[PDB]
Amino acid sequence: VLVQDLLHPTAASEARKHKLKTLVQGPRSYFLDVKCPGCLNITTVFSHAQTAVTCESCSTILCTPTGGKAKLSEGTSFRRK
Amino acid sequence: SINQKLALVIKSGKYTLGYKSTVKSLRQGKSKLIIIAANTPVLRKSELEYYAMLSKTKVYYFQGGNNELGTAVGKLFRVGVVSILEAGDSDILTTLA
Amino acid sequence: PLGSVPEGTIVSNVEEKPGDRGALARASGNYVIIIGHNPDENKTRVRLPSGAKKVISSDARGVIGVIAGGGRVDKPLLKAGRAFHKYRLKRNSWPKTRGVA
Amino acid sequence: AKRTKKVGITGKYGVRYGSSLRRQVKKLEIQQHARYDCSFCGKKTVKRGAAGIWTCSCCKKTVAGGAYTVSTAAAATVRSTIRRLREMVEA
Amino acid sequence: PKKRASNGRNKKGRGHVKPVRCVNCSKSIPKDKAIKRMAIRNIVEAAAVRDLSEASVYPEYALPKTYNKLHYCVSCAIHARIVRVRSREDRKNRAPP
Amino acid sequence: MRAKWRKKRTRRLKRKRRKVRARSK
Amino acid sequence: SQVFGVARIYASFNDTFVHVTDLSGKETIARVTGGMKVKADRDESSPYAAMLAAQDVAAKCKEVGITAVHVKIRATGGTRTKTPGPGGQAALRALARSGLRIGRIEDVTPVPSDSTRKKGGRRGRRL
Amino acid sequence: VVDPFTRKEWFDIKAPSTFENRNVGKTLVNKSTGLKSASDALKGRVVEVCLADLQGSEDHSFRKIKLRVDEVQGKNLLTNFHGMDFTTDKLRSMVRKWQTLIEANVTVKTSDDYVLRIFAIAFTRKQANQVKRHSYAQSSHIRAIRKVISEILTKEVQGSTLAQLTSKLIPEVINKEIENATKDIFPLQNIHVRKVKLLKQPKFDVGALMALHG
RNA sequence: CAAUUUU
RNA sequence: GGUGAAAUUCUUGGAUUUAUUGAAGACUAACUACUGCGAAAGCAUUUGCCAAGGACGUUUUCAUUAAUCAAGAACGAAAGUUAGGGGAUCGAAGAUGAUCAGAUACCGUCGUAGUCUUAACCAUAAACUAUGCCGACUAGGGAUCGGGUGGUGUUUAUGACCCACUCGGCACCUUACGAGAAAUCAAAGUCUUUGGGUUCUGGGGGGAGUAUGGUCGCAAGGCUGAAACUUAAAGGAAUU
């Protein structure tokens, strides 16, 4: 306060200000490279959820929708996408 | 309930309204789950249930009124009896069984 | 019969004594409660639509439900005409002149 | 147009019988002339013929109901206040 | 002037709450408003409870307790409930003593 | 007095005057 | 190994009212008021008028068989003061001395699920 | 005048048999001479009695009972059960502030031909390590645990004629399983039932009563 | 418990 | 009973109290909070249906569609009106015992209209947070409701709770930074260093929300609304 730097902020301070009240606007979601244990290929899934995603052969579950981010529900895979 | 579930059928699956095109469509067994209103008269309700007893088809006693069922199938209109004769993209077969 | 009905109900067209064939609360839109019931001393206690208490026999029958046609008297007779015509099927009781005349 | 503003059905009496006594008919006179939702055939064709009778036009079943309307305020709380009471002789 | 910060009692962002009834003066007051007083420990007290156990069979081990939850008004709280100090800085305390 | 019981004296003198204006037309 | 009773001690303000009933709850034995004893009309709510009122209820109970009681205090009840008046604590000790036996003091004051407005009005009784 | 406390005479009270000793009360009615022979003409009284004397374990001090006279045999009798209720001080002691009271009102028609209206109470406790003194519910946990506390007392049907209900309400085995059905939300509080009042006495039950004798 | 006036 | 004290008022025909069944209408306890929803009224028994909404999330879409609004409308506690159902409890008028020098008041026992519910009306109140609506800045704190993120957390495999956040909501303390006549205020600040946008209202007190005209109402009345004339004080906030 009374003198600061607004151009080299604390890089660990985006927990401390909102996703939409920071200097350069930036989202916080990402993408989930998930896989079904019954099947062979990879798909990407938004980290938050909406309509429930599918698979090619045993098209049951890769993520579930709720009020926050999704849940994969069988431990498979996430690098980053 | 099932007011949303009829609406899933009428845009997608073949169905016949009324009373005479659900008795003609029942002499081959080609109709499934005749939905019946409540105050439809017991002269015909107790003996199209009797046809359903021989055709081995389900009956749902839709406990809404007579003119209530016309709104449920969307019609600007007063229906009494529907007859879903195919359910090609539906889920009504086992959830009312 | 009143011995066959649970108390607190709304009986109608009750008799006064069994076999008398209709006695009590027959007019347009009136009805009787049964207040209590006495198994010793075979008897029921109704209250008839005057609001007076009454003990009567527990085999006096009665149909259940207010007699249809309730609420005639909201409508004013509104003229001499349809006051003449409600009486001239019943009896000569009209027009009554005042005794001071 | 609106041929009369506030008198409604009871403009056939003209200038007589009063003000607060005609409108005591007017909130009743329309109630006996209307069409009621016939709960048996399923249509709106209930009309009176007398003090109490309410015939239907299709399937012709006469509900012996209220004197001026179909069901009274009394009979509103009568078939309910034995439906309250009919289960007591059962359970 | 305006002598109370919360001018009404505990009625902020709500509007008009409910009435509830007093004890002695028997008048209605808003439920959030006036007075709630409870401080009791045991009520059947030393009028020989020590000589009530030998005035009893099955010496009963509890000597049971009553509970009420009463609401005074304010104009009987001044006549009954001891206040003893209300200056213009001790309108702000929050303690039971 | 209050401001409620001259607000009662005025609206119940007005019933006296709006009928004496209908006696003399 | 002795006979129980039921006391039903009523104690409003402006009167105290002590008796004893049977253990079946129906047969009533010797109702005693405060207003019968004194002739002052204000001592109906006095402790000392309620003191010996348990004695004439005790020797009435001890001469008919009754030895022990299941005593129950009772306030005004309903929508009234709901606390006992003056003569409550003056009376329960007053029969404890008299060769009686006590088990399971209760309280039988019924409070409502709040309803049915009481007296005074809206602005209530004025001092 | 004629002192009517001396032509009555003393009588006994006996209780049913899913209990220990049944020397419960000692009443007195009249002498049953004609002009109102009071032999089978008392017939309608009830007895409000505690559970300390009746089970011996005085730590069931509250949860009172009411017991109802049916018929008489020779200055003795046998009675039948008439609903378990709580007391006007525990349920006034129990409701502390900063918590939430729940309820469950399920009119259960029995296996036999009664109906009885069991109730229930509940509160929520400080799951300690607390810092938050309110300890409320979401008020959709109130709706949630009511959907199972109004169902776990509906396996009363298919069995448990009221003596077996008395063998199920007295040992508090039904207060156990609320903890073992609210592990969804909430392990433990003093989950009681507080009342059961019955409405539909069918008969006299001539041959279903005197088997409860000893 | 009840209390009126002081040009 | 009944109050300070008593008296009207029921009662040995059985009152008061006691237990048992019942009815009927009214209300929703204790839980209940410096807490929730609603546009303001208002809103606390569950259960089921009907539609609707606030917040929080999203790397979904549309591209300025927006703020406040003359005219005109929707909703609008209590009392009141019409016509019915019901009128248990309380209870304007009314009777009637106290009280008084005076009491058709306070105090006391009863009691009508009403309190409730249907179909319409009425459209005002301390409808108060007496301190418009939208937009942005300016000190710190601590606690709570709802939503979301991370903890190598505790407890019983989620759930509940603990810890650090952050969005929105009801508020609360501290200090005067600022402001004001002062009370006090994180808005009543960013104003004589005078301008973000935009509705409504006021000009000394009375006369007076009256008269008159219009207009709505079934009516009580509501909205619009003056003046002749008469006075130097009404008035606010704190000190003795």
Ligand SMILES: [Zn+2]
């Ligand atoms: Zn799949």
Ligand SMILES: [Zn+2]
């Ligand atoms: Zn018809």
Ligand SMILES: [Zn+2]
């Ligand atoms: Zn008050």
